[PDB]
Design a protein around this ligand. Structure first.
Ligand SMILES: [Cl-]
Ligand SMILES: [Cl-]
Lengths: 165, 167
């Protein structure tokens, strides 16, 4: 039984396989994927060596409380912004024992879209203790709630791999 | 598009459907399922009304920091125990705005099994603000890592429903 599609499962595999000999651990912070990024990473046998913790923070209160996202960041730029994603990744990294953190915030739909922030808009950020930061703004389109969530999982994993090189 | 087994999706849908008019929210604390319980609940449109937050406490450090599980519970009873499950549920509840928390700690395998704590052993606990707690020890068997994880998600969702019925 494999829950995730093969690209996601392979990317998760590569991360566990790569990170273990390097002694590297990961933390996740999720606000649209609902735990699926941690879920995908932990599908892999041996993932206990690598996965530290995950923060599932749909609510803006949870983003502030669990990850230290600023109240004014949220009120000025919204939950779904570059600024929020960066602060989420910073919080997930420093509030964990991980070497790398990836954070995502987006609109999976069907609800919650607008001209300015459409369904499928997702901001992703990854940060390393060495200081390296990567951010991408993705606009997946109105392609379905599960579809956007899985698209986001794949991008998050790709970013962890990239960060590591 | 489906991601989880139909019956798991049905259970998640029941929780979102029931809890919304009741104004109730849930938090999850996950070791062995790695976020799939929150994942399953948030497959449902409208789940944002109900799902407050989730803790994936894959390590013992995480159980301690995020949930306040005691070092004393962990070295005496183990990460996989009724006691750890109860403390996780309590921690997830009172470190959130939820009405109910569900916590799971188990051995998905393939590794880590022993006679006393075999692969497929999972402790689940749900707690409500009024103090009501439910706990189940499951022994799903050595049936595969994804299989045990999904079996755990199912039971976790069943228990949230039961805990609500009892309130
Ligand atoms: Cl493992
Ligand atoms: Cl929703």
């Amino acid at each position: 039984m494999s829950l995730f599609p093969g690209d996601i499962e392979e990317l998760a595999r590569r991360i566990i396989t790569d990170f273990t000999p390097l002694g590297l651990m990961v933390s996740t912070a999720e606000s649209c994927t609902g735990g699926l990024i941690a879920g995908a990473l932990t599908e892999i046998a041996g993932s206990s060596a690598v996965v530290d913790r995950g923060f599932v923070t749909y609510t803006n209160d949870a983003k502030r409380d669990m990850l230290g996202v600023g109240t004014e960041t949220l009120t000025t730029f919204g939950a779904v912004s570059r600024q929020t994603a960066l602060q989420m990744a910073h919080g997930a990294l420093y509030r964990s024992r991980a070497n790398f953190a990836v954070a995502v915030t987006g609109i999976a739909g069907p609800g919650g879209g607008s001209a300015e922030k459409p369904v499928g808009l997702v901001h992703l950020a990854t940060k390393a203790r060495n200081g390296n930061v990567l951010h991408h703004e993705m606009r997946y389109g109105d392609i379905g709630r599960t579809e956007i969530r899985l698209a986001t999982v794949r991008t998050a994993l790709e970013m962890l791999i990239a960060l590591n090189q």
